[PDB]
Design a protein around this nucleic acid. Structure first.
Ligand code: CL
Ligand code: CL
Ligand code: MG
Ligand code: MG
Ligand code: MG
Ligand code: NA
Ligand code: NA
Length: 326
DNA sequence: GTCGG
DNA sequence: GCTGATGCGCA
DNA sequence: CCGACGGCGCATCAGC
C-alpha cells in the first residue's frame, strides 16, 4: 500500500484523540488527513509536500517529516507505552463501551479483558453483549459469507411480505472482499415521508429473523433502526461461524436514494460529501437533500430520482460505490 | 488539528 | 410523561 | 487568531 506508513500513523493518532484524549475534532482532523493522503497518488517524500493537501497542516507535516526520517513517531511510542492510555483505548473496542465508560472503568481499576468478565454486573446490556462476542466482533467477514447472510436476509424479508425491498449496503455494496459487519437498508411501500399508518414494519422483519435463529441478540431497537447480532447456520461437527454485528435501517421508500447513499458510505466519504454540499449551499442527510436558508435553516427537499442526482446538485462526478472507499 | 471567518 | 444533554452507535 | 467542523437513531439520565 502506497502511503500506508503515514496513514496508519495518522489513524492511530486519531484513535488516540477520540478514545483517550476525547478530542473528537482532532480525531476528525487526523481522519481527514489520512483519507486525503491515502488518496494521494505519489509516495510522499516530505512534510512540506503533504502540507499542500487540504487538511494537512503544520503539525501533521512535522509528524510526516519525523516518520519519513526515522520510520516511527516518538509521540506514538510514548502512547504505546502507557498502560492507562492503552487500557482505555482497548476497552473502547468493546461494542457499547465508548470513551467515557472506558475511562471510568479504568479509573476504578478495570484494565483487562479478564477484569470485565469479572464485573459483568457493571455493564449494561449492550456492553454485556459486546463483551460476550468481543472476539467474534473483532473478526472481519469474508465476502463469501456476506453473500450467504444476504441470501438469508432477503429470503426471510420476502417471506414476511414480498413488497419489502432489502439492500445490503456498507462496504459490502462498495465491493469489499471483507466487511466489518452487515448493513441492511429496508423499504416498504406502506412507509413513506407522507406517512406511516402501518405498524411494526421493522419489527415484523426482526421477529422473523429471530424466528429462524438468524438474529441471536438485540443491542438496540426502535421503529426505524435495529442494531444487533446474527449468525450463519453451521454444519454438523464443523465449529460455529462467529457471531456478527448487523444493522438494519428502515427508510421511507420515497427517500431510498438518499438513504442508500448514506448507508453505502464510507463514513469519511459521507462526511466529505456532506461537507461539500454545504460549501455549495445544500445539506444532505439520509432522508433528503435540501438547500440552505440564509437564516441558517434548511428549505424544502429537492426531488431525487437516483443517487446520481444527489451528486449532480453539488456538482460532483458521480462516484460508483467501489470508489467511495478509502 | 486545520482552515477560515 | 416531557425536553435537552450526553453517551455510543452507524455510514 | 479564536472557534466551527455531517447528520442522526437509540438508550439513558437531569430537571422539570
Ligand atoms: Cl431519495
Ligand atoms: Cl429531512
Ligand atoms: Mg464501520
Ligand atoms: Mg458495515
Ligand atoms: Mg454497520
Ligand atoms: Na494544507
Ligand atoms: Na466501542
Amino acid at each position: 500500500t502506497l502511503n500506508g506508513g503515514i496513514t496508519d500513523m495518522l489513524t492511530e493518532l486519531a484513535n488516540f484523540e477520540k478514545n483517550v484524549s476525547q478530542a473528537i475534532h482532532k480525531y476528525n482532523a487526523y481522519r481527514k488527513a489520512a483519507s486525503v493522503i491515502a488518496k494521494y497518488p505519489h509516495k510522499i517524500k516530505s512534510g512540506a509536500e503533504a502540507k499542500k493537501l487540504p487538511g494537512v497542516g503544520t503539525k501533521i507535516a512535522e509528524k510526516i517529516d519525523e516518520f519519513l526520517a526515522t520510520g516511527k513517531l516518538r509521540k506514538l511510542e510514548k502512547i504505546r507505552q502507557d498502560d492507562t492510555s492503552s487500557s482505555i483505548n482497548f476497552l473502547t473496542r468493546v461494542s457499547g463501551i465508548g470513551p467515557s465508560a472506558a475511562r471510568k472503568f479504568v479509573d476504578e481499576g478495570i484494565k483487562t479483558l479478564e477484569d470485565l468478565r469479572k464485573n459483568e454486573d457493571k455493564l449494561n446490556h449492550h456492553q454485556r453483549i459486546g463483551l460476550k462476542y468481543f472476539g467474534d466482533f473483532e473478526k472481519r467477514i469474508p465476502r463469501e459469507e456476506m453473500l450467504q447472510m444476504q441470501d438469508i436476509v432477503l429470503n426471510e424479508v420476502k417471506k414476511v411480505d414480498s413488497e419489502y425491498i432489502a439492500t445490503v449496503c456498507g462496504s459490502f455494496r462498495r465491493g469489499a472482499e471483507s466487511s466489518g459487519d452487515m448493513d441492511v437498508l429496508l423499504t416498504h411501500p406502506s412507509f413513506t415521508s407522507e406517512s406511516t399508518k402501518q405498524p411494526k414494519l421493522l419489527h415484523q422483519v426482526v421477529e422473523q429473523l429471530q424466528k429462524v435463529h438468524f438474529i441471536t441478540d438485540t443491542l438496540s431497537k426502535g421503529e426505524t433502526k435495529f442494531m444487533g447480532v446474527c449468525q450463519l447456520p453451521s454444519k454438523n461437527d464443523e465449529k460455529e461461524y462467529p457471531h456478527r454485528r448487523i444493522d438494519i435501517r428502515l427508510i421511507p421508500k420515497d427517500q431510498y436514494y438518499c438513504g442508500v447513499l448514506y448507508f453505502t458510505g464510507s463514513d469519511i466519504f459521507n462526511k466529505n460529501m456532506r461537507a461539500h454540499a454545504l460549501e455549495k449551499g445544500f445539506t444532505i442527510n439520509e432522508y433528503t437533500i435540501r438547500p440552505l436558508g440564509v437564516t441558517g435553516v434548511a428549505g424544502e427537499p429537492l426531488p431525487v430520482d437516483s443517487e446520481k442526482d444527489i451528486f449532480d446538485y453539488i456538482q460532483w462526478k458521480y462516484r460508483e460505490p467501489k470508489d467511495r472507499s478509502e
